[PDB]
Amino acid sequence: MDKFRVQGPTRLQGEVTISGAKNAALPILFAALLAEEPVEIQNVPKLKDIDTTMKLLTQLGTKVERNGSVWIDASNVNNFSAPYDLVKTMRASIWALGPLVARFGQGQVSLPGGCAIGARPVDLHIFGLEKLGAEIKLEEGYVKASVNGRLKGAHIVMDKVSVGATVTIMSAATLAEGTTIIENAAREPEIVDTANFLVALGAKISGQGTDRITIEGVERLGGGVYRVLPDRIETGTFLVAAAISGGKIVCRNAQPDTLDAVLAKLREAGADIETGEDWISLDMHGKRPKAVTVRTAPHPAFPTDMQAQFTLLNLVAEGTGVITETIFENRFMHVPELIRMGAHAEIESNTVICHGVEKLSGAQVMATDLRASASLVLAGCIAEGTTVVDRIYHIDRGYERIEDKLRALGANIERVKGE
Amino acid sequence: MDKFRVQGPTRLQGEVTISGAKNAALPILFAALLAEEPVEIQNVPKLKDIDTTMKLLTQLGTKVERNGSVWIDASNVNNFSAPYDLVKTMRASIWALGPLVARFGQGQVSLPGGCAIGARPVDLHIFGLEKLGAEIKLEEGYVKASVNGRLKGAHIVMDKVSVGATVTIMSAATLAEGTTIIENAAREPEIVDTANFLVALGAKISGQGTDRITIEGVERLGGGVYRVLPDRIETGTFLVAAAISGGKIVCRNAQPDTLDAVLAKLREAGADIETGEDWISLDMHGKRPKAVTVRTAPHPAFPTDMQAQFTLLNLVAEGTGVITETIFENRFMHVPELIRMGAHAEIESNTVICHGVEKLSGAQVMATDLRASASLVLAGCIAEGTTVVDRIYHIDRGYERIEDKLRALGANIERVKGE
Amino acid sequence: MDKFRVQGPTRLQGEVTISGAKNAALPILFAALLAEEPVEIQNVPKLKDIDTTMKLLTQLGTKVERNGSVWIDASNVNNFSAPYDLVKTMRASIWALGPLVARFGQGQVSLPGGCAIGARPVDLHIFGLEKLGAEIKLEEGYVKASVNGRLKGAHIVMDKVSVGATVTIMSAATLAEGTTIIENAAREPEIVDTANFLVALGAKISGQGTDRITIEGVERLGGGVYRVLPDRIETGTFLVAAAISGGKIVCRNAQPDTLDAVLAKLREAGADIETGEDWISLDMHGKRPKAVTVRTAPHPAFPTDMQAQFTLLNLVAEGTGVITETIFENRFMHVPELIRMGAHAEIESNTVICHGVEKLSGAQVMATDLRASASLVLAGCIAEGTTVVDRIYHIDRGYERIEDKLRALGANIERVKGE
Amino acid sequence: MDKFRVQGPTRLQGEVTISGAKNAALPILFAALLAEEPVEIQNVPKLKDIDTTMKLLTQLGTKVERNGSVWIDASNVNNFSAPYDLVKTMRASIWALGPLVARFGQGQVSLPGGCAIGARPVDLHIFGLEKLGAEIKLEEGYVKASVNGRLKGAHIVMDKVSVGATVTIMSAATLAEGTTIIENAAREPEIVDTANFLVALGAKISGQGTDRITIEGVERLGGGVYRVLPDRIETGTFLVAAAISGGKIVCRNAQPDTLDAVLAKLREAGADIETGEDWISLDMHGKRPKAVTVRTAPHPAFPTDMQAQFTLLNLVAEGTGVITETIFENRFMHVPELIRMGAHAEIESNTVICHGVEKLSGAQVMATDLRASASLVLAGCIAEGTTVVDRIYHIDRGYERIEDKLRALGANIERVKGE
Ligand SMILES: [NH3+]C1CCCCC1
Ligand SMILES: [NH3+]C1CCCCC1
Ligand SMILES: [NH3+]C1CCCCC1
Ligand SMILES: [NH3+]C1CCCCC1
C-alpha cells in the first residue's frame, strides 16, 4: 500500500501541464465502438480505467494501441459481450452496451451485484436503451440488449440528471433511425466533449452543454482524430495548491471555460488569475487565501469534485467560510482528517463551517474519495512537519502521478511503498 | 368585482409594448429615499403599489409627482415612520426601512400581523440591517431601526436567497461606512436594475446579477435620471399568448437578455423567435405549440412566474409535457380551472403531466395568483366560446390593463364590472 | 478632400435607426419663427444645414439649443434679416422670408447673385408672398417682403410644382387673414410633415399631400412638441444596402407609408419585407436580388432620389432590368463609375439598361450627387476589394454619419482626410 | 507593389504564437540532405525561402511534403546540382553544397554573376569545403565541390565570423573522417539549433554557441523529428509592439534564453516581463516606455536585428535615449521616415540620438530593410491616423503573416495590392 510522505510547509509555485480528463476519455473510448474507420484519440491520461477500457475493447475485437493518444480500429468488432473479469473493475464498462446494440444489434455487459435495488447506477442506461427500441434482458449479474433492425429515435425525459445515462442514450442515438431528444440532459463538459467526438465521426448532435440534446441518427460513423479536453478537476486541484500555499502557478493545456465557477471562487479567495485559450495562471502574491462561501451545484455551478479542495482552502484562509454540499450526501470525510491536522470546523448537516487557521500540523491521514485524498496531500504540502497520506491508490486512479506534478511545484513528497 | 368576459378562439398577433417592471420600479422608488438631489424614474407602470408607494414617500416628506416617469425630490425627507394605514396594503413598504436608517439614522415601518412565526418575509431585512450595525426594536406590529452614526459595511452570508433582503441590505450598504459583501445574493434582473439605479446616483456596487454583491459605502447619493427595465414576466406572458394561438407578435421595449430560459423554452415549443436590443418577435407560423419539459429554478433559470403560462402552452400543445415547480409549493391552482376548460393533466406532487388537447372550451374560471389569473385570460382567448375570468383585480395589480393590450392583438375581451 | 475608403465584400445586416428627414426638418425649423411659445423639434438630424439654420435663427433673436431635438423660443425675434454670410451656404434660407413677413410684417433674405434671369429658384416664393399681400422689394443682392397689418389669404395657382415655394406660401398663409388655396402644391411627405407641424402649433391646413392645400389663417400660432418624420430616402438606401449584399435588416424609427413604391420594387427584387408602424425589416435570405424594371415619377410613385441605389441593385442582380427617369435628365453620371467596378449597362436617353453581374470589383469612384455618391459607398461594400469614394462631403451633408450606420451593419469603411 | 495600410493608434495586446526561425529552418532543411532516413522538421514557417528550398530539394531527388512540419526523405537523392532557376532567388541555396559533397561525393551550386571579386559571400564556404578535402571547380557561373571517398576532418581558422560558412563547414564535417575544429565559428542561436539538429540525426558536435565548434565525423546520419527554434527577432518585435502601445502580451512558443539582452533592455524601458521555458509575457500596465541606451553588438549582446524596433521604442518613450550600432554602418535609414511621423532624433555617425515624443502621426513611409520595414508597421499601429508602409514584400518574406498576428493583438491593418 503506497502512501505519500509529505513534508511542509512548501510554497507551491511553477508550471503544471493538465492531463486529458479520464471522464471525457472513457465515454469517448466507448463511443469509438461506433466508428467504422480508425480513430486517434489524443491526450488520454495513463490511468487504470484507460487500461481496463483498452483491454475490454480488445476483448470485443477492437484493435487498440496506445501512448499519448489511444488509436482505435473498431471496423472488425465481433464479440459483443463484455465479460465480468474485464468489467468487474469498472462501472464505466456499462458504456459498451449502447454502442454494441446501436451498431451491431446486440450487446451484453456483465454487472457488479448487490442487495440494494432501485435507482442503481445502470438502471437509467437500461431504460434509455429500452426507450430507443432496444429489447432488454436481465438476469442477476448481466444486462443483455438487442434490437430488431435499428434503434429508433425517441423523445426521452430524464427525471434525474445523469452523465452516465446521457452518454449512453446520446451515443446510441447517433445510429438510431431518426431523431432523439434528451430532456434534462447532463451538461458536464465531458458530455460536450463526447458529443463533439461523436460529431467528429459524422454524428448529428446539438444542444450538448445545454439541458436538451438533439441527435439526428445517421447510417454509420467514420473515423478521425480527436483530442480529449483537459481535466478541469485536476486543473482546479492545482489552482487550489498554489492558492493555499501563497503560490503562483501556470496550468498549461487547460480549458478555462470549463471552470468559470471555480475561478470566480478563487478570485473571491484573493487570487490573481489570468487565463488564455489554453492556460490559467494564479498568483496569491504570497497572501493567505481569504475565506469563501461555496455551494456545490450541477455543472455549470461549482463542482462537487472541487468541494474537498475548497474545504482545505477555507480551513487555512483568513476568516470563516461555509461549504455547502448539495450533490452528495456524506462527502465530508476529509474534515475529521483536517481537524486532526489542526483545523477548526463545524459540520452542520451537509455543510462545514470553517474557521481559518494560519497553519496545519502534519499527520497520518487517509481518505477514500480521490478528491478528499488529493486535498490531504495538498494540506500535507502546507502543514508543519510530516503528513502521511495512506491509500494513495485512490489518487493514482484519477490523477496521472500527482507527486511528480507537485514535486515540480516545490513539494517535498515521496511515494512510500509497503511501509 | 370586475371580471373579464373573453370570447374565443382568437389568433393573437400584432405588437405589444412592454411596461416597466413593477418589481424593479418598487425597490428603485424606495432606494430614491437615499437621493439628496431630485430624481427622474422613467418607465414606471401605473399600478396600485406604485400609487401606494408614492403616497408613502409623500408621507415621509418626499416631493413626488408622476406620469410616465416618477419624479422624486427626497432632499427634505423628514418623517421617518411608515404608518400602518399606508403600509398595510403593501409588503414592499419594508423597503423604506433600510434607506431611512442608512441616510437619517432612524426609520420605523408598521408590519402586517400573524400567528405564524419564523422565516416571516421581513425577518431577513431586520437581520440584514442588524448585521450592518443597526439597532433593531420590535414590538408586535412594527420594526424600528436606528444607528448611532453610520451603518458599517459587513460581510453578510444569506442562508436563503431573498430578493427582498438583497435589496434592503444592498441599498442600505451604499451609505454605510466601508464595504459590504453579500453572499448568496439574489440575481434577479430587478436586483441588477436597483443596483444600476443606485450606481447612477453615486453608489459603488459590483457583482449585481451574480451571487456575490460588493458595495463600497459612499457619503451621500445625488440624483439623476433612470429608466426602469422592462417587465420580463409581462413580456413572457405576451410571447405565450402568440405562441398558444398560432400567432405572431412583436414585444416592443423588451430586454431580451432577461429571458434567455423563457425564449429557449419557446423555441423548443416550435416558436420562430428573433430579438433586437429592445425587442423580441415570435412567430408560430400558424402551428400548434409542441409540448415542452419545464423545471422552474432561480434566476437565471426558467422563472416560476412563467410556470402557469407554460402550463397552459403544454395543455394545448401537441404531445405530453411536464411542468415541475421547484420554487413554490402549491402554485398549480390554474390546473383545476384549465381541466374545467377541457384540459388533460395530471398533478403528481410539485409537477403537472400535461397532455395537449387541440382546443379548450370556455368557462367561468378564477385564480388568485396573478400569473395563474392572466393564464386563464389567455386560455379564454383561444378556448371555444366564452370564458369568464373572475377576480381580475389580481391581474390589474400587476399588468397595466392587459385587456387593452390583448384586445390590440385581436382578443375579444371585455371588462365586466359588478356582474 | 475627404474620401471614403471601403473594403468588401461585406454582407450588410443588423439594425439601423433612421434619422429625421432633413428636408422635413429645415422647413419646420424656419416655420418655428411663427411660434409665439417655445417649441421642441424632435428627431432632427445633425447635419450642416441644421447648424446653418440654428445660426441663422439665433441671428434673428431666436433662442435655440440642440441635441436629439432642437428647442426654439422665437418669442423675442427682433432682427428680420438673414445676411449673406449665413445664407450664402444654404438655398433653404429663403424659408426665413415667409414666416418673418407673416409674423413680423417684414423679412429680408440676402440672395447670391447670378447672371441668369428668368424663373430663378425663388421667384415662386417672391410672387407667392406678393399674392398674399406682401410688398416685395428687390435689389440684385436680396429680397425684402413686408406688409402693414396681416397678409391676406389668396387663391394661388402655381405654374410649377415646387416644394420650396409650397412651404413658403403655406407657412406664411397660416397667419394671413382668410383662406389661401395653393393649386399644384408639392405633395411630398416633407410638405405633409410641415403642414402637420403648423397644424400642431394651431394652424388650420387641409389637403397637404394632395394637389391642393387649403389654409385658413389663424391670428397666432402657439408652441409644442413635434417630431420630424423619418428620412424616407435614407430608409430606402439602407433597405437597398441589405438587398444587394444578401442581407437582413430592421430599419427602426421608419415610416413605411412614405415608401410604398420603393417597398413594392424591393419585393419585386426578391426581398422579404415586413412592416410595422415605425419599422421595416427586409430579408434577402442570403440571395441575390432579381432585376427589376423601374420608372421614376413624382411622389407617390417611385422616387428619383432612389434611382441611383436601384441602378446599383440591378447591376448586381440576377437578370436585366432597365431604369427610366421619367422627369429628370442627366441622372446616370454614376453609371460610368459603376461600369468601372465591372458593371454592365447601356445608358440610352433617360434610361439605363442594366445587366446584372455577380460581383463588382473595387475601384476609385466619385459621384457629385448625394444619392449617387451614397450608392457608390454601398457599391464599395459589396465589391471585391477596396473602393475609394472621393468627394464624400455631399453624403456628410445629406446623411447623418452614414459611416457609423454602415459600420454597425458590417461595413468596413474609413474616412480619408487627405486627398 | 503591395503596401500595408495601418490605422492607429491601437494598443497591441493579447497572445501571439512565435514562428520557427527561418534562419534556423533554412540551414536545417539543407542539412537534412545528409539524413539517410526520413526526417520531420517541425515548426517551420511558411515563407518564400522555405518554398524555394523544398523546390530545390525536390529537384535533387528528395521527397518533401509540408505544413506545420516539413517532411523530408533524402534516401533517393540522385541529382546533385542546384540550378540557376531555383537558386537565383536565394543566397541560402549555397547550403546545398556541403551536404551534397559530404554525403554524395559531389555537389554543384549555380551562382549569380557580379563584377566584384574578392572576399565574395561564398569564398568561406568554398575554401572551408576545400580544407575538408573537397576538390573545388569554379567557372564564373557556379561552384562544384567533389571528393573521392570521404571528406576529412580539418582544423579550420575562419578569418571572418560567418553564420553561412559556419553552417556549410559544420554540416559537411559531420560525415568527414576525423575531427574538424572551426575557430571563430558564428555563435548565433540558429547555429546552435543547426548543430543540435545534426546531433539529433547522430552527429557528434560540441562547442556550438561558442567561438569554437568541434565536430567528430560519423559514417552516417539517420533520421528523426526535430523542431526548429522560435524566431527570436520576431519575438522581440512583438515584445516591442506591446511595449510601445501601453500593451500586455504573452509570446507563446518562445525561447526566452535566446533574447537575454533584449529582455533586459525592455525591463530598463519600464516593462514587466515574466518568462517560462516556452513563453514570455510583457506588461506595460498602460504606461509609456522610458528611453533606454542601446549598444548593438554580436550575439549574445543586444542584436542589431532589434535596433530598428528599439529606435522606434525610444522615439515614443519618455526621455532621451541613444542607439549605437557598434559593428554595422548605415543602419538608421528608417529614422528619416520616423522623423516624418513626428519623431525627434539626430543621426550622428553610427548612433541615433532619440528624444521621445508622446505621439506619432501617420505618414507614407518605406524602409528596405525587413526589420526597419517591420518597425514602420509597428509605428503605424501607434501613430495617430493612417500610415502607409510601401514595399512590404521584405516583411512578407521574413515574418509569417505579420498582419494576421498584429490583427489578433488589435492592429487595424490592410494589404494594398496596387501601388
Ligand atoms: N424598434 C422596432 C424593432 C423592429 C421591431 C419592432 C420594434
Ligand atoms: N424579422 C423581424 C424583425 C423586425 C421585428 C419583426 C420580424
Ligand atoms: N502557452 C503558454 C501561455 C503563457 C503561459 C504558459 C502557457
Ligand atoms: N501574466 C501572465 C501571462 C502568461 C502566463 C503567466 C502570467
Tab-separated table of C-alpha atoms and ligand atoms in Angstrom, chain B residues 250 274 279 281, chain C residues 248 250 274 279 281, ligand 2:
chain	number	residue	atom	x	y	z
B	250	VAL	CA	-43.563	41.830	-31.595
B	274	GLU	CA	-35.844	36.846	-33.293
B	279	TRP	CA	-37.473	43.814	-28.962
B	281	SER	CA	-40.631	38.819	-32.128
C	248	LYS	CA	-31.202	41.113	-43.351
C	250	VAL	CA	-34.578	46.102	-39.455
C	274	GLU	CA	-42.265	43.112	-43.199
C	279	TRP	CA	-40.171	49.906	-38.596
C	281	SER	CA	-37.475	44.560	-41.878
E	2	LIG	N1	-37.937	39.832	-38.937
E	2	LIG	C1	-38.471	40.702	-37.891
E	2	LIG	C2	-37.604	41.725	-37.385
E	2	LIG	C3	-38.380	43.033	-37.035
E	2	LIG	C4	-39.449	42.770	-35.979
E	2	LIG	C5	-40.378	41.740	-36.642
E	2	LIG	C6	-39.898	40.449	-37.508
